[PDB]
Design a protein around this ligand. Structure first.
Ligand SMILES: *[C@@H]1O[C@H](CO)[C@@H](O)[C@H](O)[C@H]1NC(C)=O
Lengths: 23, 23
């Protein structure tokens, strides 16, 4: 979805395992 | 987890298709 639709959602950072390996 | 606590354990390599896929 979009961030606006849900209620009580908190800004945070999600980490991806794949990106470090690629670099 | 880490490979210390579990009572019965065996050694084999989890293939992780990812390394092959990136290259
Ligand atoms: C949580 O409850 C407070 C009142 O205690 C209210 O002001 C706030 O908007 C509520 N937040 C959510 C995300 O439901």
């Amino acid at each position: 979805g979009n961030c606006d639709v849900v209620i009580g959602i908190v800004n945070n950072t999600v980490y991806d395992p794949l990106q470090p390996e690629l670099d």
